[model samples]
Target: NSFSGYLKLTDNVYIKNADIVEEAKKVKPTVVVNAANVYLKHGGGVAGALNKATNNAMQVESDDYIATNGPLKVGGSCVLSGHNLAKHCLHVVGPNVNKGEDIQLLKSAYENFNQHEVLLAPLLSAGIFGADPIHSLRVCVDTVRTNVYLAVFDKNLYDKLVSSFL
Candidate 1:
């Protein structure tokens, strides 16, 4: 079983099976994707993942924009409450039980990136707790990120995200 899933770094650049370091080297990608607990396990919740990804992103001089797609406070809330200490954190609301909020979350995340073209996202709990993975990817790929990285544990979810950009 593959530990890390594949993701599209950019429209023309795709990292089929890349780690955090490899994804961070994509110059100025619109958005870099990553999974929580994939690299480091500090147990500080989302904050820990943010720190790890941010540290790696800084090493490559990537933009200091961090985005997360998952249930931070609630099932559909994108507000990573634990990431208050992060340099720049953007919280996106996911789908609710009654409605597909994940699409809205993707839209909001993209729209919020108007200031900075490069953004990094740690899509930790996107597929958990009954959230649809395809819907999340659909909204994510449509945006104009110079590059987008996805750190996922599920191959199916990774395939879905990659297919959207392909």
Candidate 2:
């Protein structure tokens, strides 16, 4: 009733979209992916929203990952345990579009979030970072299979995505 629609990419691969946090809070995900910046600053965007929801527990460990891993490059990722929605949250730094590292890094982001079911994910590289949503969706759609990903977003974005596809 809440999600917009679902595409069964494979028998086990399903791509669905919704208002993420609301659904995650109810369904209780097994995995989540956080599209993040190197700074790991939960000041705004999805980071801020997730940080607030998890009571900064996610953000707190994210800082530790940064300290331990040195710095998360575009293709680099780290996992933190126990956010409100999932058993693990894969924190990934998206490609810098201004630096022209678009497709590869975006692909990396989705790839890193793969091989797991019920991955609580939203769109990547299309927010606060300025990657084309259509391109982002294609990258995601082309990336993986056998991993059940719940892609959550508002209707405006979903409609815009459909418009682009049409």
Candidate 3:
């Protein structure tokens, strides 16, 4: 199902049932975030989509970043060229809850982007990473200090996010 309007959770926070990568193209945020793993592999979920959108440049640069800076730790972030999506790409590592990691790392991941004025991101750690969808939404929405655009690609996740507002 296609949804149009966005739900506002705060003065600058909004959530929509849309693809994060596609939404990033239209919104052109100052920085678009990747719900990345520690390796910045861009292998699945939001990370894969962003890497695909950039024609694998995201991964290439990520490889270079890692080669130079070392593996990204949970709650850490680094910027990269956006390629075709936004002004830049912000790759952030959220804690893997499947491994019984602390959820506070997810909040720290969002908080690390406070310097940006506009940002687009998914519900970080909510997908294969095993964090609860609503909890991830709250972490991203509450922690980000910018005009936040959260795009949900899955219908179930989108409904969950919308229902949180409703």
Report the error of model 3 at residue 13, Å: 0.7
- Tens digits of per-residue lDDT, candidate 3, 71-96, equal 98898888888888887888888989
Tell me the tens digit of each residue's lDDT in model 2 across 73-151. Answer: 7866777785777777777777868667756778777777666645667678777767887787777777755365556
- Indicate which candidate wins on TM-score: 3
Ranking by TM-score: 3, 2, 1
Q: Write the per-residue lDDT of candidate 1 for residues 1-166, one digit (tens) a residue.
A: 1223444355622334333334444433433332332222223433334446555443122222222331242222222222223333434333343343443445554444344444555453354424465555555666545443454545665666666654
- The models' CA-based lDDT, in order, is 0.40, 0.70, 0.82
Best by lDDT: 3
> Hey, what RMSD does candidate 2 come out at?
2.9
* TM-score for candidate 1: 0.44
Cα TM-score per model: 0.44, 0.83, 0.91
Residue 95 displacement (Å), model 1: 3.5
For model 2, what is the alpha-carbon lDDT of residue 146?
Answer: 37
Local error of candidate 1 at 115, Å? 2.8
Q: What is the lDDT of residue 49 in candidate 3?
A: 87
**Can you list the residue pairs that collide in candidate 3?**
none
